[PDB]
Symmetry: D2
């Protein structure tokens, strides 16, 4: 409501209306924050601008940011500095892997396919954290989105699971680095949600019914449940929480 | 100020101003919640009553509830059902072990001691949950406090460590049971905090100092940081969070 | 092979020819070990003495030992000390919980059933390790059997899951106490196996069918696979392994 | 003495007498296995050939295999195929990261340093498995060596910790892919041992003294304890174990 009043956050990864990052943006805005959006490339610019503009308030800054490109990533955060000077956090909702690796056997993943997944889905957290460390002059929280596949084997998640494991270990090492700089680093492990990228995981419809049937809360997750947990982590209420991975998956993670 | 407005919660475990339960009480109260307190035996009625009255708004119910007593436990929740219509959660901050067993080697723990710690520090959660369920129509969240010692070996924690491990598994199984009924069950794993029961844990000062020197946030936690994470878990913001264990310990849990 | 020549181990838990403890006995025997068997009640002395005799040229010591009875427990190892003097390990394969509690919801577990399960399935490892220590003057290993349900929520496991969590934490703390005396403590988390006690777990056939179809090895575990892993753990090949939990479940534990 | 008789294993990562892979080689040899060795580059050809010759009996195949190079990888395994035909396993003991990244803040790791560690220390396992799979027509085990730094934050391990988390997740996805082909994939999480590349880790003597004082067994690990646990994983005694990470660290991993 006013939980994030006066704070400005950088949300990375909105692609369209179903993006979990969009769910995060709406929750942060409703909690009173100001936002900055970064999108992967020119193709997405229109979607993010129009989405950003549905939010009441000042025209939000929308900037291209291919996290695979160091010069653009660095220039993006320099622009952010010149524009607002200080931000209070970054929501990192980025991941990618060649579609053909998310099927069949993980053992057939090509080297380039594996490094690509690692580069975009795990390293980008660290590269982003490094630039955000510069503008988060008042400390704050850095968030990332992970998935159960990084902790245990999920069918067809393959190289993405290995990349998330690496992302989750990154959260821990970054939390270890940044805490003394007043910066908390956390992850949200969301349960399956229908998004543009969900199309790369096989038989999604049946995965969702499995969640509805077996998850403790008997229902699938929503972008809003994730965004609201994100509000907590970016807010002062989470002051003592860092290097933590919170599962917003209707409790599915406890099932053996 | 309004996050918990219109909600009523039971805070079990207040012994004095330093109790973690009290920090939770204050946080819930500052978030607009109505509180009902439960104390162990008569010796603690005066203390709790006093602290409760120090809050404002309508006076708070203060009921005796010794978790080793099934009758007094069922009576307490009977009173609550009659006095208040519904509650939206319970904050379980109860634990006990004989100081004798918290010294030296765990292999020397008596069957009596081991069963006593299990009964009070772990089973109580379930006992409380079965009663809470009766007055928790509309749903809500059940919270309990645990410690790292239930996940790994912490010097001197011994039998309490094994108790917390049960508590922690109990959280998972209860979450699995109660989710269909709209009830979430989560735990907060707090870092060392200076409390009455902190005397059983030998050489606390060295403990607080190692945390300040090695924890990512370079500070020990407080009853308020825990209180604030509880506000989150009892709120609708934590809608899809259940069967989780959130470490409010300055990030110490990630260290190896 | 001949890994255990001249070593003597106590196998507690044989009840059946299908008992996992018996699978361990046979493997220990084939690796050249001398065994001492203990059985719950007179009701089982017949089967154990009978099975124990089927081993080639052997002393075949078989003593009674109800782990809930401190007198018997103490007399059993006193007898062992008098007749053998020094043993090199103990296989703790004991567990129990009222069948009622293995049904329906965990929240309805009664206080006595919960403590019954903890006393028999978890504390006994400690009570046994305490006596065993007196007779393991050359170091050695203490093994116990746990199951996945102690780490994550497995349906129809309820109170056993929580007793197993205490058991697994007990392993860690005992390992921590005993390592300095040259004594290692480890667990084997076995996958579902048709034993007498497995009849207490609902719809076992489908449980086995699921392991067969989804476990990495596409087959269910056998008492022999567990036995052979016990051989490694009691042998010197595992002298650097303590406080560990080895899943002998065709890799099922890794599945998310 | 003949646990691995008739079996042939490929050991990757011998650099010198103090390498953990050399400890594994002696252990596998003592148990009767035949060995094929691979070295990183010309520089090590000598050292490895000399150590191999020491394993009297049969002139062991010693081949170059830079895991960074696709052709060498293919060349090495096609040679084993044409030369030996069938192997029963591979011991993967390879890791690398720039020294500068193993100090200071992990957040400062460069994209290249990060992808380099991932490539050599994590992907290499998969590339090796893809090739080994072609010559393990009879099944068998693939082993890798990880470290606590991949599960939890270990000071200065930084990027290697993230690489190891990635390696550990890979062990699981590979176990899940190769199990149906009769191939098990496992890891040994070795405790700190004085090796050639251990010089890259912070004050090693104080690290070792810490383990000697805190570790359950009150002693540091050796290449032999690792080698003996490797013997088990490659033997038929471990046929039911896959996707597992056995800690051969004197029990240190259990400490909180
Ligand atoms: N949808 C789910 O069920 C689910 C569950 C758990 C975790 N996640 C994670 O949440 C995040 C967001 O995923 P989503 O499900 O909303 O899908 P999405 O397709 O909406 O978002 C993925 C985002 O990554 C961006 N991206 C890819 N390469 C990029 C690059 N090189 N530079 C900058 N951005 C790049 C895409 O533009 C997109 O905005 C991902 O990390 C994903 O793994 C999703
Ligand atoms: N203080 C810390 O450092 C710390 C850290 C992590 C977790 N915890 C946990 O938080 C909870 C609260 O502990 P605390 O540190 O505030 O100590 P505390 O001594 O203030 O509170 C413990 C409470 O348990 C109550 N209790 C004991 N036996 C009871 C019984 N039979 N019936 C009902 N209530 C009973 C006591 O009255 C007391 O109010 C405990 O579970 C504890 O293990 C504490
Ligand atoms: N069968 C499986 O699928 C499976 C899987 C994982 C773990 N386990 C564990 O392995 C152990 C052996 O179980 P099992 O499956 O061979 O079944 P089982 O029924 O053959 O053996 C259980 C043993 O516990 C003994 N026991 C019960 N109460 C006792 C008491 N008061 N004092 C002494 N002994 C007592 C019984 O006599 C019996 O010998 C148990 O801890 C069990 O939880 C079994
Ligand atoms: N020494 C320890 O305390 C310890 C603890 C836990 C895990 N480990 C792991 O054990 C493995 C062996 O390490 P070690 O301690 O024996 O050190 P080491 O220096 O003897 O071995 C490291 C090996 O990696 C090889 N290597 C590097 N780049 C390579 C490449 N491109 N292609 C092929 N091989 C390459 C090196 O030649 C060397 O043989 C590593 O994975 C290491 O992380 C070591
Ligand atoms: O991580 C995810 C988990 C689930 Cl269940 C669904 C979608 C996910 O997100 C992705 C999956 C594959 C690729 Cl290539 C990119 C992204 Cl963002
Ligand atoms: O769990 C705790 C953890 C820490 Cl570090 C300090 C105090 C704790 O709380 C207790 C410790 C011992 C007993 Cl007998 C009862 C309680 Cl409530
Ligand atoms: O732990 C077990 C796990 C599985 Cl899958 C099957 C049997 C098991 O063993 C038991 C189950 C229930 C009770 Cl009451 C006692 C025992 Cl020994
Ligand atoms: O993983 C390790 C863990 C420890 Cl305690 C000691 C040495 C280790 O091994 C390495 C460390 C750094 C680099 Cl660059 C390469 C290797 Cl093989």
């Amino acid at each position: 409501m006013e939980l994030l009043q006066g704070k400005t956050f950088v949300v990375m990864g909105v692609a369209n209306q179903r993006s979990i990052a969009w769910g995060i943006a709406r929750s942060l805005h409703n909690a009173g924050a100001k936002l900055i959006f970064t999108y992967a490339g020119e193709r997405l610019e229109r979607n993010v601008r129009e989405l950003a503009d549905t939010l009441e308030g000042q025209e939000s800054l929308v900037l291209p940011c291919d996290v695979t490109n160091d010069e653009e990533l660095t220039a993006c955060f320099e622009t952010i500095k010149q524009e607002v000077g200080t931000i209070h956090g970054v929501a990192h909702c980025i991941a990618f892997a060649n579609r053909d690796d998310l099927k069949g056997e993980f053992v057939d993943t090509s080297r380039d396919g594996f490094l690509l997944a690692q580069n975009i889905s795990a390293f980008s957290l660290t590269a982003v954290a490094r630039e955000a460390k510069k503008v988060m002059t008042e400390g704050g929280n850095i968030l990332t989105l992970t998935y159960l596949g990084g902790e245990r084997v999920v069918k067809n998640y393959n190289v993405m699971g290995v990349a998330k494991a690496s992302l989750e270990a990154s959260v821990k090492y970054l939390a270890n680095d940044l805490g003394q700089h007043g910066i908390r680093v956390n992850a949200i492990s969301a349960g399956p949600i229908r998004t543009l990228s969900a199309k790369g995981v096989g038989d999604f419809n049946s995965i969702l019914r499995e969640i509805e049937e077996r998850a403790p809360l008997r229902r699938t997750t929503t972008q809003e449940e994730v965004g609201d947990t994100a509000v907590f982590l970016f807010s002062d209420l989470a002051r003592g929480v860092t290097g933590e991975n919170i599962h917003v998956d209707s409790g599915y993670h406890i099932l053996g």
